[PDB]
């Protein structure tokens, strides 16, 4: 069976195990630095299997050795943000956590695809590839699938149609400078601009950019985890089942969109090989101005990162 | 529980019950004019429930009375075509079958949404609305969902990506004059033209138009049923769960696209009310020439129909 | 669409919405006293719908008015225990909370089936039937499914088989005096005794009874929720779909097993009418001794209740 | 991805691909002697993937070379019976067909688990083990699951409960002497006798044994396929996923139940190694009398076999 290790048994990590367990994709190992929490959640999720009717070996541990030879490593060990806080504000703390987790996990699963979740996403994914020394295409960050999910939900709501017939690409760093792409958004093949007037669409775009903060302000004591976990799980599945999914993820660029040496949200084809191909959309001038704005923001965090 | 009556327990009818049963959408009644066939298939499908683990009341009958008060009526009682035959070639035979089924079923389920499948699709759907006297929006034909499914499969194959991230609109009568719309086809929001060169895409378009014949030539003794049944079931589900799905179906037009008094494949929003809204895409000159060609073909069958 | 209100959007209530959403059973309303909490969780979960592909309306609220006309009401507003506590220890705080939630919701959804979860389960379920005045059959408590789930899990683990083939009846109050029934537990119709040695089976019976506490001692700051939520969800589904599932639930006894006027974990046929039948099993003396000892523990919580 | 080859693309084989596709277990190869048949059905089913949303490679072929390196081989090439025939009546024609299919496929997929379906089931499964020379554990016949499925269905129907709660062991040869075991059949762990009266239960035991013929007499031009396919699929899944399901399958006995050198319907733990364990149940005299009578009917088909 496939082996999936989730490093950090917090809200996102545990919910990822939940979405995953239901798909019967393989053994799931929940690791955490706090004793009892992963073991407890693992056992509890395990005990639900007879009810839901899924066969899954879910275990919790505080020992990295238990993650050895994993096919996929999900990193959700970073500290979350509190209201009135920015994802980059977490960089110093999460950089240490991320470095700690990667340096211990990577060596034990050299053939694993690492899916980073810790914020700030782009900078942490970059730090992961950097610490693991893994092939760039096997070190990616979850962000775009979530961002686009929010965006697609808002448009489905606004248009009054099933979220099943809604697709939308979105690029950039996982932050305020985020860049949803209305031109690359459709409903059963039809441009969304045909369904939503410019003013409403622009609001939707703004809501998408602040989507994470919106939830943080409501919860007060934590950040989102249902959508984020669902996104992470869709990526794990893409990899384990080599589905060749076309989705936005934080991938290492070497010139695409005119950007180099940076993890940035771009559309890719996800499969057993991890990032199998980085798509290069024909973005117009407006879109590119937005994209470049985001690029500059991410670059900023990298400069912060490199000085830590 | 919701009640779904499938008139005609042949290949498409039975496979529809199969796709449906697995979704637990309600009671399923399989009706046929031949004794034993529906009862046999009903019982056999019923006996699979303990294995698949779905609760469904599937019954077979030769008595229309058993279809009374159905929420949805699926009509798959028409005679299929043999190789080297055209769907319109079935018009005379299937017109009588269709008239017979509708006149007996409709009265028993006045509040039902009728989903026609019998070929020639557009002309038979028109005959159904005509015989049932039902509100035009509650009498629709399955065709576009199938045609587009074929089209989406070919592009997924060609592009090497999951069929999950592929959407494509397609219009016109369910025939050779069919009109897939590459401009209204995307992969995770991205135009397919970005993935498939014009020559290959044009082949895909041609294959889509002949997709049904392709399968007929292979099977020799019958026509497709897996995809067709899956399409019909997706529509039944859209209705029963009021999903507001954006999909192409044969709907009654009153001026849309410049067409009037005709059942034609157009994108609609499908829900509890049946055809809840007919979308009007901004089709360019080329697309419209194609659309008008298809319109003329359908009109021809209607003229044939009306003279029967 | 059906409507399900979940009073108390904490771990169990939110997780319950999660399992439920994936099932597309109908609209879900998450209510809580803390503002923002239910709104954020409902939005977060709603934003996962495009990723997972389900059409579900999940809303968060602080106003009982939003729960009006619900078909089912899940109550998960109770405070959870910490290590060292018994479920009975929560009776003072939760009797108040429970009375508050039921007095407000019940009047608004007169035809609903109320499913209690708050601990102590059997007492709280009695209280809810009392405060609501609803027919006893439409007021039930979730406990048996969860308890039997832990039991079935330990069995599958021990026998090295799939949980999908393990069935097991479990009776009594949701507490330490809980009565797992080895003689009424089978693997694909084969008595469990044929797979597990008595001594081992005994340890399993014991682990089952102490299952909740095992998790509490691991989590340390909360109690189980994945299995509990799954259990609650299955019950919600049984009612909404009128599945007529045979399962153990805290129901109102009027003489069965020689017990009167108490809510007790017994096997029932759960459907659209709530408890549609209470099964009276031919328990033997050893089993009846365990059952009576449990009914005694329950009656004791009820006397504490009436004392509040 | 895993690979599954289905030899014989008729009703059972095609339907088996259908159930399988929906499960996304891996690539499926439909093979047949008639050209076009497997190609059309595989394409048709493949074109349903966008509608249903599964990523499955389904190919049709007439060349055994395409079945190379399969993980599992389903054999459904046998001729089906017509009203008036017994399954044994097909032994001459199907022994030939079966030998032909196994001699060609087995050599190409040496590590595969072969699952026979062709009737007479027990004899054909023995033949396949013989012609293939594969370890007996990796050659099994599908029969028990289907037989017990019909039984569980009749029970649920009679008891007015959900098939999801009915378990039932069934042993012996896949013929009239089939042995459903009431004493080894439970509803949520509760003996079936507690729900159905002996006289009624007897009629059910009898209906089960004659289940196949009931359908044959209804269809008239073929035999059951939905349940058979579902049964076969569950077995394929058990192997591919290494679920360790406890179920009745025609396995090779070397003394169990005092039977040697025959393929017989017995309970086993089915996993990645095929039959990983044969369970020896404490049947009583009445049950052993039925079992022996069945083993006699089976030995008789084997003597007919060796006579071909
Ligand atoms: N990229 C996205 O789209 C996205 C979405 C949501 C959350 N996030 C981010 O993901 C992270 C996790 O969010 P959360 O809400 O689940 O947080 P959380 O606080 O609930 O969980 C983090 C878990 O990590 C564990 N942990 C800490 N150090 C560890 C170490 N060295 N090894 C192993 N485990 C360790 C903690 O003990 C804790 O259980 C945050 O940084 C958050 O900002 C990103
Ligand atoms: N619109 C599409 O996209 C689409 C796709 C596939 C097939 N079709 C069409 O659907 C029809 C059914 O195809 P099939 O392959 O399932 O055929 P089939 O021959 O397998 O089944 C038709 C069934 O109708 C029954 N029948 C005949 N007259 C009846 C009456 N008066 N009442 C009740 N039942 C009656 C038959 O006995 C038979 O079992 C054909 O007309 C075919 O061309 C349309
Ligand atoms: N098998 C069972 O029956 C079972 C299983 C698990 C938990 N439980 C019990 O269920 C309850 C919930 O457990 P939890 O872990 O989810 O707790 P929790 O603390 O996470 O959540 C309870 C939620 O109720 C809310 N709340 C409080 N008063 C309220 C009121 N008047 N109206 C609406 N909401 C209100 C809180 O603000 C909180 O969000 C506990 O009492 C626990 O012991 C029972
Ligand atoms: N419970 C069971 O074990 C069970 C259940 C149902 C059916 N069956 C048996 O399974 C067989 C299939 O039933 P069916 O209804 O699908 O029949 P069918 O006639 O529909 O299909 C059999 C297919 O095998 C093909 N075939 C013939 N010779 C072949 C060869 N040498 N190689 C490859 N393909 C070949 C045919 O052309 C045909 O498409 C029958 O023998 C039937 O009695 C067993
Ligand atoms: O905002 C957060 O911290 C987490 C959700 C997200 O990254 O979108
Ligand atoms: O071609 C046929 O007759 C049936 C399949 C379709 O209508 O596409
Ligand atoms: O142990 C607890 O408090 C909650 C879980 C349960 O009721 O089993
Ligand atoms: O009755 C038949 O021939 C096939 C179905 C079965 O084997 O039960
Ligand atoms: Na477009």
């Amino acid at each position: 069976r496939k082996k999936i290790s989730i490093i950090g048994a917090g809200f996102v990590g545990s919910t990822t195990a939940h979405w995953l367990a239901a798909k019967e994709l393989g053994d799931i190992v929940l690791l955490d630095i706090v004793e009892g929490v992963p073991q407890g959640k693992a056992l509890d999720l395990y005990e639900a299997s007879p009810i839901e009717g899924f066969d899954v070996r879910v275990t919790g541990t505080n020992n990295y050795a238990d993650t050895a030879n994993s096919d996929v490593i999900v990193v959700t060990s970073g500290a979350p943000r509190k209201p009135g806080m920015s994802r980059e504000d977490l960089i110093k703390v999460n950089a240490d956590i991320t470095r700690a987790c990667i340096s211990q996990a990577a060596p034990l699963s050299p053939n694993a695809v690492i899916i980073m979740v810790n914020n700030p996403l782009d900078a942490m994914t970059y730090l992961a590839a950097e610490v693991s020394g893994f092939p760039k295409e096997r070190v990616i960050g979850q962000a775009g699938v979530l961002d686009a999910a929010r965006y697609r939900t808002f448009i489905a709501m606004e248009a009054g149609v099933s979220v099943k017939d809604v697709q939308a690409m979105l690029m950039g760093g996982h932050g305020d400078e985020m860049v949803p792409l209305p031109r690359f958004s459709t409903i059963s093949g039809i441009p969304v601009s045909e369904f939503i007037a410019p003013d409403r669409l622009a609001q939707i775009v703004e809501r998408t950019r602040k989507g994470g903060g919106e939830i943080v302000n409501l919860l007060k004591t934590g950040s989102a985890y249902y959508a984020p976990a669902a996104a992470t799980a869709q990526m794990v599945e893409a990899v384990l089942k080599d589905k060749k999914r076309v989705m936005p993820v934080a991938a290492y660029l070497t010139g695409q969109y005119g950007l180099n040496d940076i993890y940035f949200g771009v559309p890719v084809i996800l499969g057993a090989g991890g990032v199998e191909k980085i798509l290069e959309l024909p973005l117009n001038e407006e879109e590119m101005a937005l994209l470049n704005a985001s690029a500059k923001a991410v670059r900023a965090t990298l400069d912060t990162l490199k000085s830590l």
Side-chain angles (χ1 to χ4, degrees), chain A residues 10-158:
Chain A
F11 278 104
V12 187
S14 59
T15 310
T16 299
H18 182 168
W19 287 120
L20 247 26
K23 302 174 187 301
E24 296 195 309
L25 296 174
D27 303 337
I28 296 170
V29 169
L30 272 162
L31 185 155
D32 204 291
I33 188 169
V34 181
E35 295 174 42
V37 12
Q39 295 85 344
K41 298 171 181 178
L43 179 60
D44 179 21
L45 177 53
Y46 202 129
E47 302 181 347
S49 64
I51 298 162
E52 287 299 313
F54 57 72
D55 296 291
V56 295
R57 306 171 211 162
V58 192
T59 62
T61 175
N62 300 109
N63 196 309
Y64 272 105
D66 284 300
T67 58
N69 312 306
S70 296
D71 298 309
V72 176
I73 297 186
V74 171
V75 186
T76 51
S77 60
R81 68 206 268 232
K82 303 158 189 172
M85 196 167 249
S86 173
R87 295 188 186 71
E88 309 89 55
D89 288 304
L90 306 165
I91 199 168
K92 191 171 184 178
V93 174
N94 288 357
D96 296 322
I97 292 176
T98 299
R99 174 174 287 88
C101 300
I102 298 297
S103 59
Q104 301 178 75
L108 308 177
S109 299
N111 314 309
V113 162
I114 300 181
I115 300 182
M116 180 61 64
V117 178
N118 293 185
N119 270 148
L121 191 286
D122 308 277
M124 291 301 90
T125 304
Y126 188 107
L127 169 60
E130 193 168 59
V131 178
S132 70
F134 277 35
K136 292 297 181 302
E137 65 269 28
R138 284 204 287 104
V139 176
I140 64 176
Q142 187 296 310
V145 177
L146 169 62
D147 295 324
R150 283 174 178 149
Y151 178 58
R152 297 159 67 196
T153 299
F154 302 150
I155 112 82
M157 288 189 263
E158 186 65 47

Side-chain angles (χ1 to χ4, degrees), chain A residues 96-301:
Chain A
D96 296 322
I97 292 176
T98 299
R99 174 174 287 88
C101 300
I102 298 297
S103 59
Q104 301 178 75
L108 308 177
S109 299
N111 314 309
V113 162
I114 300 181
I115 300 182
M116 180 61 64
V117 178
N118 293 185
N119 270 148
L121 191 286
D122 308 277
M124 291 301 90
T125 304
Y126 188 107
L127 169 60
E130 193 168 59
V131 178
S132 70
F134 277 35
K136 292 297 181 302
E137 65 269 28
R138 284 204 287 104
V139 176
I140 64 176
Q142 187 296 310
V145 177
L146 169 62
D147 295 324
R150 283 174 178 149
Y151 178 58
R152 297 159 67 196
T153 299
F154 302 150
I155 112 82
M157 288 189 263
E158 186 65 47
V161 298
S162 165
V163 295
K164 288 177 178 175
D165 310 304
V166 176
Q167 49 176 57
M169 185 52 48
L170 176 156
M171 295 181 231
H174 190 56
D176 292 346
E177 295 62 48
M178 175 178 315
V179 187
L181 300 165
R183 192 157 69 88
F184 293 96
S185 303
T186 50
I187 296 180
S188 289
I190 309 161
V192 294
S193 60
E194 285 299 296
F195 297 81
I196 309 173
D199 59 301
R200 205 63 192 65
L201 186 54
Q203 290 185 295
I204 287 170
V205 167
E206 227 318 76
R207 190 182 188 180
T208 298
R209 298 187 177 189
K210 313 294 182 175
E214 174 177 12
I215 295 174
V216 169
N217 293 330
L218 295 176
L219 300 185
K220 311 269 185 56
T221 54
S223 37
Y225 48 89
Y226 290 117
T232 300
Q234 203 187 207
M235 286 172 71
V236 173
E237 180 193 59
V239 175
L240 297 184
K241 283 195 171 180
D242 188 56
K243 288 186 174 298
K244 314 304 188 189
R245 293 307 295 285
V246 173
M247 54 180 53
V249 314
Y252 189 74
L253 305 185
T254 49
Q256 297 90 345
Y257 301 100
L259 314 175
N260 180 228
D261 187 34
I262 185 184
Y263 260 99
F264 202 68
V266 298
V268 307
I269 286 196
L270 195 53
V275 172
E276 279 173 21
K277 194 173 73 179
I278 295 181
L279 306 189
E280 316 198 20
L281 307 184
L283 300 183
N284 62 36
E285 194 178 301
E286 308 166 64
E287 302 164 337
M288 279 305 302
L290 289 173
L291 196 171
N292 285 118
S294 183
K296 185 171 186 176
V298 175
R299 170 58 57 187
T301 71

